[PDB]
């Protein structure tokens with residue numbers, strides 16, 4: 001739907017983010033991580049602002065992967081929160097939170113944080 | 123299955139109405155008690171539909187883009203956390219709220235916090 | 243002045259022993275109840291020594307590098323948050339715990355969480 | 363003291379981080395931000411691992427600025443948590459938390475998060 005966001009993207013780790021930005025504000029696609037307790041593709045879903053500001057600001061968005069697929073389950077989920085900055089060197093700039101299922105006793109060490117920059121492969 | 127589906131509230135008084143699909147999907151609406159928000163917003167997310175059997179929580183996350191028919195804050199929040207069910211269920215999360223900005227102001231684009239939800 | 247100086251504990255049972263200098267400095271020791279840590283570690287930090295007068299909290303933060311004479315976890319935590327004093331004082335924080343890693347593993351170097359401290 | 367960490371660094375915003383890594387594990391210096399509610403230099407203090415692993419891992423560290431100096435007070439503090447990766451293109455890679463003093467009612471919006479990469483000017 002939104003042609004700028006829709007496509008196949010890679011981040012600095014070489015993970016592959018395949019997404020469609022639909023007329024309804026949804027992000028729908030698959031994610032394949034180059035790192036971590038992950039193999040092959042995982043379902044993702046998210047949302048984006050389908051009417052962004054016309055003042056040069058980016059388009060806010062986010063999405064989630066739960067790290068379960070037909071062949072592995074890491075008992076974990078990542079959410080990416082960020083913005084799409086369009087134009088000739090378009091980027092999706094994010095920060096993310098990866099929470100693993102833990103006992104309450106280990107909950108203090110349940111969540112990793114980082115940042116991913118995605119560039120379109122297209 | 124999971125016990126996630128239902129109406130939840132957090133420490134701010136916001137309302138999270140969610141349905142957990144058998145496939146790992148989360149769907150529903152979010153209404154914030156605070157910020158540049160009015161009425162309900164669509165959410166989508168994912169959860170681990172086959173959690174560990176060892177007393178660990180269930181990983182999950184979801185997104186809201188803060189545009190609805192009433193208002194658009196040009197921002198989006200993601201919650202990442204764990205669910206524990208049963209009669210005193212709780213969802214314990216950390217969240218990232220990114221506002222659209224120019225690249226020069228990206229350093230001040232993202233708030234971080236933590237929300238605890240209980241079932242209403 | 244501020245009321246920060248003292249012995250504090252968090253929800254994990256860790257102990258934060260701090261002195262607030264008149265110049266904005268924080269000094270003292272931290273003992274974690276969890277993780278790759280034993281005994282006391284040095285901390286340093288800073289706080290706003292001239293906070294607003296409007297009922298806002300006092301911004302502060304501090305660092306611990308997890309090396310002492312007993313153990314070295316090759317990691318460091320920073321807490322960033324706000325202090326409210328008085329008889330039921332609390333320090334509400336978010337924290338980032340970075341472990342040294344190679345560049346290939348920097349994506350998994352940093353834990354994030356939130357600690358609430360009360361005075362012992 | 364530690365010559366690799368000690369020096370004058372700039373980040374991607376053009377802020378200037380002047381630091382000494384002392385034999386006692388302390389970081390001591392000043393910070394000048396290119397952005398935000400800030401002017402001139404602010405005191406910083408922090409800590410670093412003075413005996414890092416010899417396996418190629420970085421050197422963990424962190425520091426704090428409270429945004430009060432002789433001429434402005436933002437009623438806020440930032441902490442940077444990260445690691446120094448030495449060698450010919452040395453970097454200090456961080457994530458940070460900027461908490462502002464707020465009322466309890468506004469505490470939900472008290473804290474910004476981001477990431478800074480510092481390169482040595484020397």
Ligand SMILES: O=C(O)CCCC[C@@H]1SC[C@@H]2NC(=O)N[C@@H]21
Pocket residue numbers: 011013015032033034035036037038067074076077078096098100114116349
């Ligand atoms: O190890 C796990 O729990 C599952 C895989 C996590 C991969 C993380 S998600 C954030 C970061 N960005 C990526 O592309 N991969 C890693």
Ligand SMILES: O=C(O)CCCC[C@@H]1SC[C@@H]2NC(=O)N[C@@H]21
Pocket residue numbers: 132134136153154155156157158159188195197198199217219221235237470
């Ligand atoms: O102000 C905005 O940009 C939109 C509303 C944001 C509300 C935030 S989302 C994180 C926190 N938890 C809530 O229930 N509300 C606030």
Ligand SMILES: O=C(O)CCCC[C@@H]1SC[C@@H]2NC(=O)N[C@@H]21
Pocket residue numbers: 108252254256273274275276277278279308315317318319337339341355357
């Ligand atoms: O395991 C390590 O690398 C060193 C100990 C880390 C303990 C962390 S710091 C954040 C949280 N709050 C605490 O009081 N302890 C844990």
Ligand SMILES: O=C(O)CCCC[C@@H]1SC[C@@H]2NC(=O)N[C@@H]21
Pocket residue numbers: 229373375377394395396397398399400429436438439440458460462476478
């Ligand atoms: O606006 C304020 O409250 C004080 C100045 C904050 C500047 C922030 S700290 C994180 C980021 N990195 C910088 O070099 N400057 C900004």
